[PDB]
Amino acid sequence: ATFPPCARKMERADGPATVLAIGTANPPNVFDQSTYPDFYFNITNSNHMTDLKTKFQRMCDKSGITKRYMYLNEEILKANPNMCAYWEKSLDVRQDMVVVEVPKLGKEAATKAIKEWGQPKSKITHVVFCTTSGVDMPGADWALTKLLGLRPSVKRLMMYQQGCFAGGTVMRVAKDLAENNKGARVLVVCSELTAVTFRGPSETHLDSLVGQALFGDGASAIIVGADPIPEVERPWFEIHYVASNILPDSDGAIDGHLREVGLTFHLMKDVPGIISKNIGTVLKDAFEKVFGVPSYNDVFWIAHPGGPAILDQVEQKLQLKTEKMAASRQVLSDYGNMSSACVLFIMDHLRKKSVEQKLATSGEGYEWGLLLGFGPGLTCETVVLRSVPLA
Amino acid sequence: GATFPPCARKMERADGPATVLAIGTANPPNVFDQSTYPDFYFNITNSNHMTDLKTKFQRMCDKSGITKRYMYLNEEILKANPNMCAYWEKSLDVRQDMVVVEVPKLGKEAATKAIKEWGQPKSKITHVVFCTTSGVDMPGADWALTKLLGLRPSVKRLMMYQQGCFAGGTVMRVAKDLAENNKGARVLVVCSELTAVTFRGPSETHLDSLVGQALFGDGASAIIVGADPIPEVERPWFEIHYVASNILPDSDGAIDGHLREVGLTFHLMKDVPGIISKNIGTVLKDAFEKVFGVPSYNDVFWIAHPGGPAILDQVEQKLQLKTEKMAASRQVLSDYGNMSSACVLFIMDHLRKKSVEQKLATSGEGYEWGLLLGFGPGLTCETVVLRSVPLA
Ligand SMILES: O=C1C[C@@H](c2ccc(O)cc2)Oc2cc(O)cc(O)c21
Ligand SMILES: O=C1C[C@@H](c2ccc(O)cc2)Oc2cc(O)cc(O)c21
């Protein structure tokens, strides 16, 4: 039924997939969240909606966000009233920005990780590009290859319209890319701009208004590879286990539609409830596969900060000491919800703070840890990591 | 820069090559004869007065190598939406309404056929890869297919949106690493394309857009890919041995596609069949050196994405292939048109059945090795070196 077998024609690697470098970047315009409602209702000329604006200040005050970064600014928004309206034909100007600027922002981040990695660009064999902001053909992955000058033969994978969970998904993809091909070095970039989703306020769509309070811009990048060249490359985290789950009872919890008015956002279920109701069995299964088992308080946490209530209730139902979501709360506070890019921001922050504080490992002195993606589906991606030992 | 002491791989990997274990296809119900499509198209777009354009379109249609296409769009549907029959009126929203529903739906038909031939319970599918360039949504068509098929909540999904005609080669490259790096992985790969996003009226000043209206058709195909097959339970059809991607030289801008409020727009800004056929020699000889260190182009089997007849004709020409090499690729073009990422999988199915039916020695026309090729928008060339299985 088969021809005589032959040796693996493309040699695989032997160790686990490993993060060799992380780099991040953000657009230049900073918005303090405490005065965001004044700004938002000005630039959308909706100051007549007094009660709604009061509702919005509530949402921002409780978002857990201190500031956000945006490609958009007051100059750009006044030039584009159709994006300042709530529901106006827009999609073309929105595309015209993001198809250019998300690979640009991904380039900044990619270049920092490449600098930290320190090997020549030519040793990059795969590119994985992930975004929720706009689509084009050829894709941002191709544009990133052009902007960087990688080999024309890099193997590319373009991930469009993914949602907040794909920070976890890119780990699972790069895991197989790096481990099945010997010598592979995977450049992974998540780049997100809210220009597809900024819109004016509407008194009958408060869920859209939550989005306006939570979403910010940012790009994150990592270099993943197996069998790191000792004394030349530097490991920071190891990918050991990956899993994906559509949580029970979550049909229709979050939807997003790309329409003539841009990307629209729709909440219809208790997202933090469903996540914290089901996270225990998700992580129990994972820990059984991986170990046979350490506590939840004795691993490092990298969790996507969908909103504060997600981290709050996961912290509550799993009885985590408040220090566990710290690195995750810290990123949400400095940047808001950057969709897929958040977890690589948390991962970078976690390792840097581990070094500065001279802890035993790169995961706050713990050996094992979790990366968690949350989004539409409701979809949960689970990534069990190992850190590296540190001085 | 130290490392915790190594431990055995947490997730066991497979050892054999990724193997195709089943193929299924499906098409929408509405059939459009190619010879009289010009009469139909120019009438439904209210342009019978564009009389020189029509005769140019009849020329493209007759010289397209296509005998018929299948489409979700029918007559009735198109009159419901005059903004889609215009060349350039805003209509993305009615397009999205169609394809976010019908893309997963047609993929379900193909996937169910595939699972039936595969023979195993659908509960043993561990991975889903959904490939399309018809519309986007959150959650994606990959989520909807999981729902309509009733697969496990915990399938590892990969959602490929807005890909291009090369991605039928990309899914194979994607599924190769999924299957090989995960012992017992069984990957459902589905490509599903509907022209509802790309259909639009004619324009004298955009004959590239008009080329697409002559070549693009609808369809979906699905495969099951796994490594280390269960002996006597599963049946291997092709093995994936080597994959490669190249952006062809100086091909900057040859094929673009933009999703706008008027839908998906299509542009040819260079000589595409020339660029492919000028460089495919270099692409193929590198792949053959990698896997063989060596069979001749006429002694392998060919699954070539038939973006249009000129491409196949000029690859046939400059590699100097005996004309039965591209036979199977032309057959699918003739019977279906260009179905974007779904074509090479239709060709793979037709190739193996033609081989079984004519009692040849392997699933690949009697050859051990073969090529699957994708072409699209970098200009990107996807290369797959495959092996057949012996039949008797
Ligand atoms: O509507 C959006 C915008 C998107 C987004 C966030 C930040 C960014 O920078 C770019 C896009 O995030 C989302 C995530 C979802 O799960 C569902 C959604 O509808 C959206
Ligand atoms: O314009 C389109 C539409 C798409 C398509 C084909 C058939 C089908 O049924 C659905 C979509 O194929 C493409 C492939 C490309 O490389 C570039 C493009 O611009 C396009």
Numbering used by the authors:
A (entry chain A): 7 to 298, 304 to 402
B (entry chain D): 6 to 298, 304 to 402
Lines from the paper:
Chalcone synthase, a well-studied ubiquitous plant-specific type III polyketide synthases (PKSs), is the first key enzyme in the flavonoid biosynthetic pathway. The biosynthesis of flavonoids starts with the condensation of one molecule of p-coumaryl CoA with three molecules of malonyl-CoA through the catalysis of chalcone synthase (CHS) to generate naringenin chalcone. Functional characterization of two chalcone synthases (CpCHS1 and CpCHS2) indicated that CpCHS1 can catalyze the formation of pinocembrin, naringenin, and eriodictyol, respectively; however, CpCHS2 was inactive. The crystallization investigation of CpCHS1 indicated that it has a highly similar conformation and shares a similar general catalytic mechanism to other plants CHSs.
The crystal structure of CpCHS1 was elucidated in the apo and presence of its final product naringenin, and detailed structural comparisons of CpCHS1 with EaCHS from Equisetum arvense and PpCHS from Physcomitrella patens revealed common differences between CHSs in the local conformation around the active site pocket.
